[PDB]
Amino acid sequence: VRGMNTSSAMSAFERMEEKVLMQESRAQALGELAGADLETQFAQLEGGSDVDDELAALKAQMLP
């Protein structure tokens, strides 16, 4: 109940937390860096431009 250093419950939570926190933080940070780059941002804008022209073409195709 007090929570001794050698107690299994206290030790397990601490060990699990350190490993879990580092892994989660690192994965999120790595993903963010890719997003930060200008080229990636440009691609998203290009994609938006790309979908609308196709839709217009699709409308023309399905018009008759």
Partner: protein, 52 residues
């Protein structure tokens, strides 16, 4: 203190090598659940004796 300085350097080197091997998440998780269940059984036996 000279002894204190020596102790810190020796302890740090030893601790770093040791922690990495046992820091894997999967091994730690399996060990923790098994241990608590065993403890409960032991506690119950002690409680049972008191009740008796």
């Amino acid at each position: 203190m000279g002894l204190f300085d020596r102790i810190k350097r020796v302890v740090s080197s030893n601790l770093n090598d040791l922690v990495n091997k046992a820091e894997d998440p999967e091994k730690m998780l399996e060990q923790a659940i098994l241990e608590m269940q065993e403890d409960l059984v032991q506690l119950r036996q002690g409680v049972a004796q008191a009740i008796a």
